[PDB]
Amino acid sequence: HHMLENKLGIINQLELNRVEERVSKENAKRLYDSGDIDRIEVGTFKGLSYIHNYLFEDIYEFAGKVRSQNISKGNFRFAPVMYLEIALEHIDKMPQRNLDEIVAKYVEMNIAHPFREGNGRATRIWLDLILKKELKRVVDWNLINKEDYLSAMERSPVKDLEIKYLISNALTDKINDREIFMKGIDISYYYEGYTEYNVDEL
Amino acid sequence: LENKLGIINQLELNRVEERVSKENAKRLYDSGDIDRIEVGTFKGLSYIHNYLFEDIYEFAGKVRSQNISKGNFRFAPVMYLEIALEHIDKMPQRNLDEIVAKYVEMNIAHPFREGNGRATRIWLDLILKKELKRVVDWNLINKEDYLSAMERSPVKDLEIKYLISNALTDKINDREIFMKGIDISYYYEGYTEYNVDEL
Amino acid sequence: HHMLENKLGIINQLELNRVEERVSKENAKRLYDSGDIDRIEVGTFKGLSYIHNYLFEDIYEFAGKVRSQNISKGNFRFAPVMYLEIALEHIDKMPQRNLDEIVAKYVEMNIAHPFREGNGRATRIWLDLILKKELKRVVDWNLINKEDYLSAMERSPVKDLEIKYLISNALTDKINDREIFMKGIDISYYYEGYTEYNVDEL
Amino acid sequence: LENKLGIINQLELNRVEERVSKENAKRLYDSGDIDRIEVGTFKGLSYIHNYLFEDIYEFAGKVRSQNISKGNFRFAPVMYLEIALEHIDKMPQRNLDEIVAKYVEMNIAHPFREGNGRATRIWLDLILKKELKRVVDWNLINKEDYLSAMERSPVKDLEIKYLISNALTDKINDREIFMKGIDISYYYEGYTEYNVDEL
């Protein structure tokens, strides 16, 4: 599902990590600077899919499309492909009127993990848009320490108090501030282990 | 938990639930209704569960609408609980292995808001009796061994198969085994006040 | 380590559960009504040991003494016997000046799990005494739902935010109120799966 | 993390740490100091760690005083970290099995406040070279396979033994293998900005 491996024959793990950061962070910058970020359906798998394909169209095969394989990160098991579609339809109709609802919906979408890869980054953009539209806030992701966030996300299916704490104490009303967006892209990628570039410099 | 008896204190609700529900278990068996239930489907499990809990909970026999977990495990998300139940229904149950795998799947499903383990072990005995003419002498299974095997069961089900296999008896119409099974099964879940056959 | 099994030949699991609740809850009532509860060293393994033996002297072999076997509840692994003594000495010198310190010390003592059995109940009495002495508060344990508490305790070694939330929102300044104590004994035992008796009726 | 360079932003600290520490790794190897370290003790590991991190952290080479965890696993509690280190020191290291068991134990220990996985993989290569005249061609081990095996290692260490065994090479004095190992080992931990041999 790595198009660069398939076509370009770049097979080394670190270098493919870096090329994926390069290309997809450039796409993310384009997403914001075009205003495309704010012209897409909010809180729906259609919106998540638009985002995923915007970032990864050249990078992951079938970007923006539901995966066809079961995936899991360690002990954390994501929705079986079997049930993905129905579950996503079920996520579409979840409400998003306050922070509690929005957090619960973000958590269900994380469990769903609809893509083979790129779920974290794309779903964090999805989430920030939901918060913008519904609460007129976004997350200042630089305030949320990487390890705290990853632990909170892994705990969120049993109890979402941790992720709720982090998210609520990192909300700002700087909803269209370019630095918040660009910094959050750098932080979001750093969560996943890409640290080479600043999105601003692409 | 919202209950139709207006209980607020969690321990009083625990004891009220034990009293009411174990009495309905005794009735389920003595009336013979237990022998008139579809075996191995969520339809039968729902019947069992409503039978035990209708008096005390409005959510009895119904697929839950909230997500629930126990410790570090989240049961089948509401996103796909129902479709998962539809697929557990089609699971074969021809030998002890397939039956225990089906039981482990239904336990991961945990379809009700409350009362899952107890209703589901009654369910499992129904499957075992229909297909192997055995049931589980639950008194032979220590609570810690059973809870440990169940926690391990989503990743390896071999221990829960061991325990169940070694507690099976062909005394499938023995009332003492059933009532003692009810008390032990409630004891797994932390209900110890009552002896069912004394209700 | 079940003396009733060893001497009385009561071997059935449910009945031994019930007899242990009967005898040890009666001891717990004695603990409070004698005032013995408030004449013991606070926040030390010596105090925890006094409590454990007060409750379980007739019930568990070598009550109040450190275990000689490795134990674990499921995926949760407690300090190896190997390291128990040193660890307990290390727990003795932990500070207890605010709720954060007290919670962290309670968590380390839960990981330690110094006894073969009876750790939860005895350590909750230990904890309530620390809170009484240092903050002039105790926990109203009936406000803390069993499943919330057990999840929080299992999560406490990675992140103690959950158990801290529960404990802090269930503090009361009714530090010598008999109903708080007796109810908390009933609730504490119910956490562990003993529900037959009210301690007040013994 | 309090660092002596006054960094506040977590990602800038990540990059500063990569730059400084990988440079000290290059120096550790090029100077030959890496061949003058006690092999298989916390003394040697502490030396490695201070060598990498003294410039950036005050806690370099020191046994941590805070507890730390990663996701759902808590590393060896401060209650008994030191005594646990004393016992890991006495672990034999005569074959690949005993060495990997020792490495898994030291990883559970996670003795430093930060920098454990990287310093400890350098440590492990030292043990492997001294005892088997092999090292790990880390480029042959995919990050996901390695992290997965390490998460599983406290309960079953057979997968981490598999991966390590199948990545071993007798090229124990090959600088390209070492520098590439440094980059891959930092990449496991989420540091990808720099190539060490270009520092």
Coordinates of C-alpha atoms in Angstrom, one line a residue, chain C:
Chain C
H1 CA -3.0 -19.7 53.3
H2 CA -6.7 -20.2 54.1
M3 CA -6.6 -21.3 57.8
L4 CA -10.3 -22.2 57.6
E5 CA -9.6 -24.6 54.8
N6 CA -6.5 -25.9 56.7
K7 CA -8.2 -26.5 60.1
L8 CA -12.0 -26.4 59.5
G9 CA -12.0 -28.3 56.2
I10 CA -14.4 -25.8 54.6
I11 CA -13.3 -26.1 51.0
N12 CA -16.2 -24.8 48.9
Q13 CA -15.2 -21.5 47.3
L14 CA -18.5 -19.6 47.9
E15 CA -18.9 -20.8 51.5
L16 CA -15.3 -19.9 52.4
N17 CA -15.9 -16.5 50.8
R18 CA -18.9 -16.0 53.1
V19 CA -17.2 -17.3 56.3
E20 CA -14.2 -15.0 55.5
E21 CA -16.6 -12.1 55.1
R22 CA -18.4 -13.0 58.4
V23 CA -15.3 -13.3 60.6
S24 CA -13.2 -10.5 59.1
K25 CA -16.0 -8.0 58.9
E26 CA -16.6 -8.7 62.6
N27 CA -12.9 -7.9 63.2
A28 CA -13.3 -4.7 61.2
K29 CA -16.2 -3.6 63.3
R30 CA -14.1 -4.3 66.4
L31 CA -11.3 -2.3 64.9
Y32 CA -13.5 0.8 64.7
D33 CA -15.5 0.4 67.9
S34 CA -12.5 -0.2 70.1
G35 CA -10.9 3.0 68.8
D36 CA -8.0 0.7 67.8
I37 CA -8.3 2.2 64.3
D38 CA -6.9 5.5 65.5
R39 CA -4.0 4.2 67.7
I40 CA -1.7 2.8 65.0
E41 CA 1.2 4.2 63.0
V42 CA 0.0 5.9 59.8
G43 CA 1.4 5.5 56.3
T44 CA 3.9 2.8 57.1
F45 CA 4.1 -0.9 56.4
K46 CA 4.0 -1.4 60.1
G47 CA 0.5 0.2 60.1
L48 CA -0.7 -1.7 57.1
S49 CA 0.6 -4.9 58.8
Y50 CA -1.3 -4.1 62.0
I51 CA -4.5 -3.6 60.0
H52 CA -4.0 -6.8 58.0
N53 CA -3.5 -8.9 61.1
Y54 CA -6.4 -7.2 62.9
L55 CA -8.8 -8.2 60.1
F56 CA -7.4 -11.5 59.1
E57 CA -5.5 -13.1 62.0
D58 CA -7.9 -16.0 62.2
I59 CA -8.5 -16.2 58.5
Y60 CA -5.2 -16.0 56.5
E61 CA -2.0 -17.8 57.6
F62 CA 0.8 -15.4 58.7
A63 CA -1.6 -12.4 58.6
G64 CA 0.2 -9.1 58.8
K65 CA 3.4 -10.7 57.3
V66 CA 4.9 -10.2 53.9
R67 CA 4.0 -12.9 51.4
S68 CA 6.5 -15.5 50.2
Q69 CA 5.1 -16.1 46.7
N70 CA 4.8 -14.0 43.6
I71 CA 1.2 -13.0 42.9
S72 CA -0.6 -11.2 40.1
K73 CA -4.2 -10.4 39.1
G74 CA -4.5 -11.1 35.4
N75 CA -2.2 -8.8 33.4
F76 CA -1.5 -6.8 36.6
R77 CA 1.7 -8.0 38.2
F78 CA 2.7 -7.1 41.7
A79 CA 6.1 -6.5 43.1
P80 CA 8.2 -9.7 43.1
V81 CA 8.8 -11.2 46.6
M82 CA 12.5 -10.8 45.8
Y83 CA 12.1 -7.0 46.0
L84 CA 9.2 -6.7 48.4
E85 CA 11.0 -5.7 51.6
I86 CA 13.2 -3.0 50.0
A87 CA 10.2 -1.7 48.1
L88 CA 8.2 -1.5 51.3
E89 CA 11.0 0.4 53.0
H90 CA 11.0 2.7 50.0
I91 CA 7.2 3.1 50.4
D92 CA 7.7 4.0 54.1
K93 CA 9.7 7.1 53.3
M94 CA 7.4 8.5 50.6
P95 CA 5.9 11.8 51.6
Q96 CA 2.1 12.4 52.2
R97 CA 1.6 16.2 52.4
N98 CA -1.1 16.7 49.8
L99 CA -3.5 14.6 47.8
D100 CA -1.0 14.0 45.0
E101 CA 1.6 12.6 47.2
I102 CA -0.9 10.5 49.1
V103 CA -2.4 9.1 45.9
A104 CA 1.1 8.2 44.5
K105 CA 2.0 6.4 47.7
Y106 CA -1.3 4.5 47.8
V107 CA -0.6 3.5 44.2
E108 CA 3.0 2.2 45.0
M109 CA 1.5 0.3 47.9
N110 CA -1.1 -1.3 45.6
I111 CA 1.7 -2.4 43.2
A112 CA 3.6 -3.7 46.2
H113 CA 0.6 -5.8 47.3
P114 CA 2.6 -7.1 50.3
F115 CA 0.1 -9.8 51.4
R116 CA -0.9 -13.0 49.8
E117 CA -4.5 -11.8 50.1
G118 CA -6.5 -9.1 51.7
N119 CA -4.4 -6.3 50.1
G120 CA -7.3 -4.2 48.7
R121 CA -9.4 -4.0 51.9
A122 CA -6.5 -3.5 54.3
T123 CA -4.8 -0.9 52.1
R124 CA -8.0 1.1 51.7
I125 CA -8.2 1.4 55.5
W126 CA -4.5 2.4 55.5
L127 CA -5.3 5.0 52.8
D128 CA -8.2 6.5 54.7
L129 CA -6.0 6.9 57.8
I130 CA -3.3 8.7 55.8
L131 CA -6.0 11.0 54.4
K132 CA -7.5 11.6 57.9
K133 CA -4.1 12.4 59.5
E134 CA -2.7 14.5 56.7
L135 CA -5.7 16.2 55.1
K136 CA -8.5 15.7 57.7
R137 CA -10.6 13.9 55.1
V138 CA -11.5 10.3 54.3
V139 CA -13.2 8.7 51.3
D140 CA -17.0 8.3 51.1
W141 CA -16.4 5.0 49.3
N142 CA -20.1 4.6 48.4
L143 CA -19.8 7.5 46.0
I144 CA -17.2 5.5 44.0
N145 CA -18.7 2.9 41.7
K146 CA -17.0 -0.5 41.9
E147 CA -16.2 -0.8 38.2
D148 CA -14.8 2.8 38.0
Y149 CA -12.6 2.1 41.0
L150 CA -11.3 -1.2 39.7
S151 CA -10.5 0.2 36.3
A152 CA -8.8 3.2 37.9
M153 CA -6.7 1.0 40.1
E154 CA -5.6 -1.1 37.2
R155 CA -4.7 2.1 35.2
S156 CA -3.0 3.8 38.2
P157 CA 0.5 2.4 37.4
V158 CA 0.6 4.0 34.0
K159 CA -1.4 7.1 34.9
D160 CA -3.1 7.9 38.2
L161 CA -5.5 10.6 36.9
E162 CA -8.5 8.2 37.1
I163 CA -8.0 7.1 40.7
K164 CA -7.1 10.7 41.7
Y165 CA -10.3 11.9 40.1
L166 CA -12.4 9.4 42.0
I167 CA -10.7 9.8 45.3
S168 CA -10.7 13.6 45.3
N169 CA -14.4 13.9 44.4
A170 CA -15.4 11.4 47.1
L171 CA -13.6 13.1 50.1
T172 CA -15.6 14.1 53.1
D173 CA -14.6 15.8 56.4
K174 CA -16.7 13.3 58.4
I175 CA -13.5 11.6 59.6
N176 CA -14.8 9.8 62.7
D177 CA -18.4 9.2 61.6
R178 CA -19.4 5.6 62.3
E179 CA -21.7 5.4 59.3
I180 CA -19.0 6.5 56.9
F181 CA -16.7 3.8 58.3
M182 CA -19.2 1.0 58.4
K183 CA -20.6 1.8 55.0
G184 CA -17.1 2.0 53.6
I185 CA -16.3 -1.4 55.0
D186 CA -19.4 -2.8 53.2
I187 CA -18.5 -1.1 50.0
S188 CA -14.8 -2.1 50.2
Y189 CA -15.7 -5.7 50.6
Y190 CA -18.2 -5.5 47.8
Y191 CA -15.4 -4.2 45.6
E192 CA -13.7 -7.6 46.2
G193 CA -16.9 -9.7 45.7
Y194 CA -18.2 -10.1 49.3
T195 CA -21.8 -8.9 49.6
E196 CA -23.5 -11.1 52.2
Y197 CA -23.3 -9.1 55.4
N198 CA -23.6 -5.5 56.8
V199 CA -20.6 -4.9 59.1
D200 CA -23.0 -3.0 61.4
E201 CA -25.1 -6.1 62.1
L202 CA -22.1 -8.0 63.5

